[PDB]
Design a binder for these strands. Structure first.
Ligand SMILES: Nc1ncnc2c1ncn2[C@H]1CC[C@@H](COP(=O)(O)OP(=O)(O)OP(=O)(O)O)O1
Ligand SMILES: [Mg+2]
Ligand SMILES: [Mg+2]
Ligand SMILES: [Mg+2]
Lengths: 669, 105
DNA sequence: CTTTGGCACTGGC
DNA sequence: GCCAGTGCCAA
């Protein structure tokens, strides 16, 4: 077993040079440095360890080092370098599994001071290394009179870089041992720094293997990227911008501008009394000035003001104008501010007909801005993230949520507007395999979308089996469960039924339920007891969960399907923890088993192959396929993998998937 | 004795009144504005004949002040033949106002 | 007491 | 530019 790390000239997307690398070998117990001209040697050392059936530990190597080495080996030495997945360990992946209850800076991509809770020390050091290095570099430059440019610290190799490389491995080794000392994931009788790869995976908790496989696969997905229709979005943007302008014109016509105090530095005191009137706007008493075409007069106080135009994106302005028209707020926040969300706006009533109608314009404006922000103007907008290859390469933290679910960002591809929401068709349609032309034939690729059916309700069935002998597990298979619930609850759409049942299942109050279905708290009661009485085992499961965890905590974690510890945050959110985690672990093993089966059939993963993962949205995968025949196999294979996962964990409820073939996300979901 | 302007009556009442008109742009929530107010009531009848005192609440009439670049209140604009002949910002004592007016009349 | 997440936009220092 | 307060987008 060896621990390693490299330093290169840029992020994976544009990296072109290997600066240096360091390797600590457990069998010799020594650190060996490899400078620019030692690149070939560095690679040989890694392949040698592979030849022994050994292991290579990297911190975030799955997403950076490994694929970067493959790329740099081709470019610099014209060598084929491909470390096998089974020989690699990733301390970042491991810490995200062990300390799943903590946040991290995603290797410095996130501002640490913004994250809640504490951060693991070793990992904190590692994620901050580049920023620390950058500081030492700038400092040393200013000390020698040179000016600092962008991020020149990465352009050329140097001994400061080499020292940081060495420090990475020392810290990474320490992190590793710390992680390997957790008896729950790694049995005490085995020295995991002294065994072959096959032993490492087979003797450790199943979760260790699953996370590393999920990370390897997801890193590949990121590299594949999601084909994006840039032109369609730029046109959607023009359309939205014009509608925004017209709405602004109409609104600034109905709700005129006004002045407010701004710039007051002095306190206003009553002339006669002299007592401070902190309520009155702050003023200014000009020092110089007299009766001299100057406008001010020394000692003659005035209130500095500013002119402000109505801004529809300002809940404050809105609240101000609506009350000025007779609106009396019914709900406020824990700051005094009156609630101004779509639900409240929808309920506002005023006399002036024009102002009343203006409320709809305001709701439309806020929505339009919501789309412009996500698609084009926001810092994380799609148009700002499209790459040269015409694809958006969203980032994915495979185990970023406490429940074992993954998190998505830059931009967050798991929050694209639904096809049934305003402008959702266009948004959704811009993400599609059809927008990728085959590297050989130039023909558009096809998309295969697969989604687990009634996932978390089936997880409920599973855990309720010991209480109801599988009745629910059986009845849930009688037609579509959500459509069946929609009818019983008399809801307008299947989506409404889904958000209803889950809200209910996870403790939504009577009022909250009412809101969800668009009614009152009394209607919320009806529904709550209606579905609760129709399946009393739900209460039994809840009681059992409670008795196990609470006594003050009797134990603050649930044992996941693969054996890991799943941190519980609240007794009231415990059932959600149990079911969301089960569902998350099922889907994770699922996407892994799916690709593994496609490859066993001979299919190749990549744009220069047969299929390519473009996105994973919790219990949904969207896969690009070179042909329709391949799309058909992906769909069929995804269903087999799911039944396999269900059998693998002796699940008490049958598991299913629904697949769709089409050119884009609008049609495949 | 004082002329209370509106956005719609401003043009004909001020810009065409051809004579001396002192306009006071104010707001109820302004301390200084509340200060020079009493002063204006007296200046009114005292200069009754050689000047006209007009007031415009900027909250009720939001369209006029911006055209004059108001930056603070109370703002005192002395118009002459539809044009600004002199301006002063802040709560001036009666003495200073009388000076400003006599000096500009 | 729905839960797990990302992210935009106003407004204060 | 940092941060609290709100509120919407998804699963
Ligand atoms: N509103 C919600 N609140 C809490 N958890 C939710 C909510 N919506 C979805 N989830 C969880 C439970 C189901 C899981 C996947 O979402 P999805 O929309 O695919 O539901 P599902 O799998 O039950 O439905 P379907 O059979 O239509 O695909 O995410
Ligand atoms: Mg590194
Ligand atoms: Mg589903
Ligand atoms: Mg889904």
């Amino acid at each position: 077993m060896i621990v390693s790390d490299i330093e290169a000239n840029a992020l994976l997307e544009s990296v072109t040079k290997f600066h240096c690398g360091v390797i600590y070998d457990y069998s010799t117990a020594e650190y060996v440095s490899y400078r620019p001209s030692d690149f070939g040697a560095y690679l040989d050392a890694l392949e040698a360890e592979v030849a022994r059936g050994g292991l290579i530990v990297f911190h975030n190597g799955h997403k950076y080092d490994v694929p970067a080495l493959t790329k740099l080996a081709k470019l610099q030495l014209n060598r084929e370098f491909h470390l096998p997945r089974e020989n690699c360990i990733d301390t970042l992946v491991l810490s995200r599994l062990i300390h799943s209850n903590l946040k991290d800076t995603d290797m410095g991509l996130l501002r640490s001071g913004k994250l809640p809770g504490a951060l693991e020390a070793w990992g904190y050091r590692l994620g901050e290394m580049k920023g620390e290095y950058k500081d030492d570099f700038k400092r040393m430059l200013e000390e020698q009179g040179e000016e600092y440019v962008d991020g020149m610290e990465w352009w050329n190799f140097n001994e400061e870089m080499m020292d940081y490389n060495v420090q990475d491995v020392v810290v990474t080794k320490a992190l590793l041992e710390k992680l390997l000392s957790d008896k729950h994931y790694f049995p005490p009788e085995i020295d995991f720094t002294d065994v072959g790869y096959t032993t490492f995976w087979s003797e450790s908790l199943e979760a260790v293997d699953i996370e590393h496989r999920a990370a390897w696969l997801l890193a590949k997905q990121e590299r594949n990227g999601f084909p994006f229709d840039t032109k369609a979005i730029e046109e959607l943007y023009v359309e939205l911008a014009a509608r925004r302008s017209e709405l602004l014109r109409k609104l600034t016509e109905t709700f005129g501008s006004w002045y407010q105090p701004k710039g007051g530095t002095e306190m206003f005191c009553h002339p006669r009394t002299g007592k401070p009137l902190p309520k009155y706007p702050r003023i200014k008493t000009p020092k110089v000035g007299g009766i001299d075409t100057r406008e001010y007069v020394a000692g003659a106080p005035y209130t500095p003001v500013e002119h402000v135009v109505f801004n529809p994106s300002s809940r404050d302005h809105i609240q101000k104008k609506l009350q000025e028209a007779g609106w009396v707020p019914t709900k406020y926040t824990d700051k005094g501010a009156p609630v101004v969300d779509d639900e409240v706006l929808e309920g506002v009533r005023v006399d002036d007909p024009e102002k009343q109608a203006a409320i709809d314009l305001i709701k439309e404006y806020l929505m339009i801005q919501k789309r412009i922000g996500q698609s084009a103007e926001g810092d994380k907008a799609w148009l700002r993230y499209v790459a040269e290859d015409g694809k958006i390469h969203g980032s994915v933290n495979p185990n970023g949520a406490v429940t074992g679910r993954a998190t998505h960002a830059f931009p967050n591809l798991a929050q694209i507007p639904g096809v049934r929401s305003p402008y959702g068709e266009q948004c959704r349609a811009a993400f599609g395999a059809e927008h990728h032309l085959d590297g050989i034939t130039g023909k558009p690729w096809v998309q295969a979308g697969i989604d687990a059916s009634g996932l978390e309700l089936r997880c409920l069935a599973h855990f309720m089996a010991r209480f109801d002998n599988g009745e629910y597990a059986h009845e849930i298979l009688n037609g579509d469960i959500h459509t069946k619930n929609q009818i019983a609850a008399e809801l307008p759409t299947r989506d409404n039924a889904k958000t209803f049942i889950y809200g209910f299942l996870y403790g939504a109050g009577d009022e909250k339920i009412g809101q969800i279905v668009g009614a009152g708290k009394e209607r919320g009661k009806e529904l709550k007891k209606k579905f609760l009485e129709n399946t009393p085992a739900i209460a039994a499961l809840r009681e059992s969960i409670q008795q196990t965890l609470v006594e003050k905590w009797k134990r603050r974690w649930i044992k996941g399907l693969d054996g890991r510890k799943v941190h519980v945050r609240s007794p009231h959110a415990a059932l959600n923890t149990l079911l969301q985690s089960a569902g998350a672990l099922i889907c994770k093993l699922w996407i892994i088993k799916t690709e593994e089966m496609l490859v066993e059939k001979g299919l190749k993963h990549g744009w220069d192959g047969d299929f390519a993962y473009m996105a994973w949205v919790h219990d949904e995968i969207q896969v690009g396929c070179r042909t329709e025949e391949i799309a058909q196999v992906v769909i069929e294979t995804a269903q087999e993998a799911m039944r396999w996962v269900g059998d693998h964990w002796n699940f008490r409820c049958l598991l299913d998937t629904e697949g769709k073939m089409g050119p884009n996300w609008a049609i495949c979901h | 004795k004082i002329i209370h302007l509106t956005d719609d009556s401003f043009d004909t009442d001020v810009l065409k009144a051809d004579g001396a008109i002192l306009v006071d742009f104010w707001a109820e929530w302004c301390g200084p504005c509340k200060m020079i107010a009493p002063i204006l009531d007296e200046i009114a009848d005292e200069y009754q004949g050689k000047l006209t005192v007009a007031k415009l609440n900027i909250d009720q009439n939001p369209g006029t002040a911006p055209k004059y670049g108001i930056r603070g209140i109370p703002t005192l604009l002395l118009f002459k033949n539809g044009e600004v002949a002199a301006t002063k910002v802040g709560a001036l004592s009666k003495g200073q106002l009388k000076e400003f007016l006599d000096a500009n009349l």
